[PDB]
Amino acid sequence: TPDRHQFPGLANKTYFNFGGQGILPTVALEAITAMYGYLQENGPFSIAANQHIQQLIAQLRQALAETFNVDPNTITITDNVTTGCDIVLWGLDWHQGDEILLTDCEHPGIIAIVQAIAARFGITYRFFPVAATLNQGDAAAVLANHLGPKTRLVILSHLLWNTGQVLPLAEIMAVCRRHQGNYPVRVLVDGAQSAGSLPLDFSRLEVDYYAFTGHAWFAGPAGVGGLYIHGDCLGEINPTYVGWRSITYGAKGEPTGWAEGGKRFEVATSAYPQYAGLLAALQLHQRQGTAEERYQAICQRSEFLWRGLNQLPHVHCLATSAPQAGLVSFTVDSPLGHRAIVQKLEEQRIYLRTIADPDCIRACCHYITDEEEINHLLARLADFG
Amino acid sequence: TPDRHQFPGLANKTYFNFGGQGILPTVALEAITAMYGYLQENGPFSIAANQHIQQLIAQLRQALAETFNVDPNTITITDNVTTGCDIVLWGLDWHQGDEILLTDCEHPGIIAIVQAIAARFGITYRFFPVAATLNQGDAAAVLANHLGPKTRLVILSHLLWNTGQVLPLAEIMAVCRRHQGNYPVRVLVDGAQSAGSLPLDFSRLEVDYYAFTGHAWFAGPAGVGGLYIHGDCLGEINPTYVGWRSITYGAKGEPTGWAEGGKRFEVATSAYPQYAGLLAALQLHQRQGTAEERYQAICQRSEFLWRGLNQLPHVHCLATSAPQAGLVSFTVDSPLGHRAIVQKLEEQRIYLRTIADPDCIRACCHYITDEEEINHLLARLADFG
Ligand SMILES: Cc1ncc(COP(=O)(O)O)c(CNCC(=O)O)c1O
Ligand SMILES: Cc1ncc(COP(=O)(O)O)c(CNCC(=O)O)c1O
Ligand SMILES: [K+]
Ligand SMILES: [K+]
């Protein structure tokens, strides 16, 4: 039984875009507003304010650490999912000829970093087909058939943003560690959709690097995200974008080394009030139930929506089995085109999004989504054909 | 005649830390709060919201451009001063043996980037003495005596954060362009203190790269800054940290090239509401008078404080002539030590800061600062000896 009242934005609209950005809870806006007030009353720049900011940062780092069941030292605070990927990709000691493998469902922004890396260090990159494994096949086996002697890193999204498939991460990791080549194969995971929807425990689930954001499923404000790096991989990642937050200081205030753990990849002044907003959102989700309970609630909503769409004659879900998470992608048989359809729905205050590849429409159901909203969506979709 | 009422934080304290972070004006907090409301009512992720966000970004880019009298295409929006420096430094095509020259008054965070760059590309770096040129000498001449055949870039703070000196940027640029070596010498300027206090016109003042932030003298919120790159230098800067905001898109949503002008160095999701806050703070300053008028007002206040300190027997200003800007640094003859003195002042709600090198105390006077605040500071300082 979710407390929908904590998310005022739900009230006069039918929202299904949590994957793009979550509806901000009241407690998050209160924390943001309270931080501006604290800074105005006590600083904004002063011993008291600077200490309050450092304490707030430690508190967020700790809440994130607890969310994934890991030590705070493995957590880096960023502004979004992408930055975490930039940190890992630019930090690796690349040699000409090294190879990177990405799935064919990765984000355009991520592909751009890889192209930038290829141009700078002379590495190469290839894609491997996973989109087609939504209803059959094995993504891990596809990867195994693409691994080569020069493969050094694999990049994949845990929950695919376009089709809604949850990749078999554990099996994929095993395939990578089993491989014998010039390098021990490592895996960088884009968790833009998975973090905050799927139950994640990095002490049970072995991962190398995991990038995420707080503004989508975690329902925090735009501008705050994070990155997990396993303690055994920290040494392989050289800091790149650095600043006063990245170092330790000497007698005369001179740089003497890298800050502890993930702090070495943090740069400088950030939007502190927003950090308090994310912290408040994180604590709110825990009061609603465990990650597991919230996950099952999300799946109950997506399946209900999925079933409803299966009944509509001119709508075709991409998944032939129940969604493994909160994402439900589908096409609509109509002369209008998916972008015009999404715009018409928004005109009715029903919010979904268009996907470029494959060309389809995507809806996100969260644990706070209810049956009336789903039925209202189904009702309006019934109009096209 | 400044409208102090627009800056509510001034009221029950005596603030002199504008160089660390400016007091946020009411119109800025209103704009931030209003943006959260707009996102909640119209999205937060949707056609309407996404368009509103893009329009806000263009509006801020344009206001910044007008502030420095340049074309919007030369402006990149970042989170702070440091990021701008990381973009320029990591973007240059460094070759082993290349040399970087920095003043001995640069920020620790900036030095850390340079050290990271030296380790990665095998370049070298050396400092040149400018601190000692506050009351005598010529910083441009010092630089001329250090320039070598392999010198490729010079890094300097336009307004020194530790001593308050305004470097002779025009003369320094001439010296650099006059030099004949293996590379045409370029200059990266750290404008953490100068932007928003000194009148800056990059159409009259020729500069290569100029990094700045909006949270200090411009009085915007923590988290939003920017970077200027001359059109003739854009090509030499390769994008490094990139994301979906850095590229142009193709038919199937794939990367087809770099976004226009400075957009190529912008990454991904940011704290949009804060952008509206900086935009509002920028427009507020323009309503108070021109940059020149505000600069003279700042100097009238700093000289008044400087004169006041010269009268105190146990206080010694670092500058033997009137401050060239709003920064007034000084030492205090006392067994207590400068950090204990700053803490005691804060106990009395008087806000200044300690400087590590040279070991001194620094006060910042803005155009909104008044005589009562300065006299109150002088009164409490009189207590030490
Ligand atoms: C799989 C995946 N990876 C990266 C992003 C970009 O996130 P940002 O926080 O802006 O760095 C996304 C964004 N998805 C929004 C959506 O799917 O609607 C993503 O899905
Ligand atoms: C000269 C100089 N350079 C960089 C910074 C860092 O700015 P950030 O926006 O956090 O990247 C500063 C900060 N100064 C604060 C102060 O002077 O009190 C600086 O001075
Ligand atoms: K159907
Ligand atoms: K004196």
Give chain B's largest Cα–Cα span. 73
- Which value, to the nearest 10 degrees, does the dihedral of the CA atoms of residues A136, A140, A141, A144 take? 160
> Checking phi first, is residue B247 left (phi over 0); if not, alpha (psi -120 to 50) or beta?
beta
Three-state SS annotation for A213-236: ECCCCCCCCCCCEEEEECCCCHHH
Q: Which of A14, A60, A20 is nearest to A277 (CA)?
A: A60
Stated as kind and residue range, the H or E segment containing A186 is strand A186-190
| A41 in reach of chain B (CB within 8 A) | yes
Tokens of A347: 């005109």
> Checking phi first, is residue A267 left (phi over 0); if not, alpha (psi -120 to 50) or beta?
alpha
What's the CA gap between A74 and A65, in Å, rounded? 8
What's the CA gap between B38 and B108, in Å, rounded? 39
Report how many helices (DSSP H) and strands (DSSP E) chain B contains, helices first: 10, 15
Provide the pairing of β-strand B151-157 with B186-190. parallel
DSSP string, B98-133: -EEEEETT--HHHHHHHHHHHHHH--EEEEE--GGG
Are the C-beta atoms of B47 and A343 separated by less than 8 Å? yes
Alpha helices in A75-232 (DSSP H): 81-91, 108-121, 139-144, 169-178
- Determine whether the shortest distance from the Cβ of A81 to ligand 1 is under 6 A: yes
Neighbours of A141 (CB within 10 A): 14
Q: Best residue in B7, B41, B46, B87 to probe A by mutation, most A CBs within 10 Å?
A: B46
Instruction: State the smallest CA–CA distance between residue A122 and chain B in angstroms.
Output: 14
| B39 in reach of chain A (CB within 8 A) | yes
Closest chain A residue to B344, measured at CA: A47
Peptide bond before residue B44 is cis, with ω within 30 degrees of 0: yes
B111 and A255 in contact by Cβ < 8 A?
Answer: yes
Q: Do the first three CATH levels of A6-24+289-384 and A25-288 match, i.e. the same topology?
A: no
What's the CA gap between B312 and B258, in Å, rounded? 58
DSSP string, B211-237: EEESSSTT---TT-EEEEE-TTTGGG-
Stated as kind and residue range, the H or E segment containing A188 is strand A186-190
- Determine whether the shortest distance from the Cβ of A155 to ligand 1 is under 6 A: no
What's the CA gap between A205 and B54, in Å, rounded? 39
Measured by CA distance, the residue closest to atom 7 of ligand 1 is A81
Neighbours of B242 (CB within 10 A): 29
Taking contacts as CB-CB distances below 8 angstroms, the residues of chain A near B110 are 243
Q: Which of B158, B175, B173, B178 is nearest to B103 (CA)?
A: B158
Amino acid at B211: A
Amino acid at A307: R
Are the C-beta atoms of B117 and B99 separated by less than 8 Å? no
- Determine whether the shortest distance from the Cβ of B243 to ligand 1 is under 6 A: yes
Amino acid at B218: F
Burial class (CB in 10 A: 0-12, 13-18, 19+), B236: middle
- Determine whether the shortest distance from the Cβ of A80 to ligand 1 is under 6 A: yes
What's the CA gap between B255 and A112, in Å, rounded? 7
Question: In 3-state terms, what secondary structure has residue A97?
Answer: coil
Half-sphere exposure of B231 (CA within 13 A, CB side): 7
Question: In 3-state terms, what secondary structure has residue B25?
Answer: coil
Amino acid at A361: I
Residues facing B361 on adjacent strands: B330, B354
Instruction: State the smallest CA–CA distance between residue B178 and chain A in angstroms.
Output: 31
Tokens of A338: 């998916």
Q: How long a stretch of residues is chain B?
A: 385
Peptide bond before residue B255 is cis, with ω within 30 degrees of 0: no
Question: In 3-state terms, what secondary structure has residue B154?
Answer: strand
Buried (b) or exposed (e) across A1-28, using 16+ Cβ within 10 A?
eeeeebbebbeebbbbbbbbbbbbbebb
Are the C-beta atoms of A186 and A175 separated by less than 8 Å? no
CB-CB: which of A107, A242, A273 is closest to B112?
A242
What's the CA gap between B188 and B207, in Å, rounded? 8
State whether CATH 3.90.1150.10 applies to domain B6-24+289-384.
Answer: yes
Q: Which of B154, B186, B182 is nearest to B96 (CA)?
A: B182
- Ordered by start, the domain boundaries in chain A are 6-24+289-384, 25-288
Q: In chain A, which among 71-90 make CB contacts under 8 A with chain B?
A: 79-83, 86, 90
Task: Name the residue of A161, A215, A218 whose CB sits within 8 Å of the most ligand 1 atoms, as the mutation to test its pocket.
Answer: A161
Are the C-beta atoms of A112 and B246 separated by less than 8 Å? yes
| A343 in reach of chain B (CB within 8 A) | yes
Instruction: State the smallest CA–CA distance between residue B154 and chain A in angstroms.
Output: 18
Residue whose entry in the numeric block shows the structure tokens 């300027």 = B189
Task: Name the residue of A79, A244, A266 whose CB sits within 8 Å of the most ligand 2 atoms, as the mutation to test its pocket.
Answer: A244
Q: Best residue in A27, A269, A339 to probe B by mutation, most B CBs within 10 Å?
A: A269
Question: In 3-state terms, what secondary structure has residue B327?
Answer: strand
State whether CATH 3.90.75.20 applies to domain A25-288.
Answer: no
Tokens of A86: 């930039």
Residues facing A361 on adjacent strands: A330, A354
Tokens of B102: 């920095």
State the resolution, in angstroms: 2.0
Task: Name the residue of A241, A269, A270, A272 whose CB sits within 8 Å of the most ligand 2 atoms, as the mutation to test its pocket.
Answer: A269
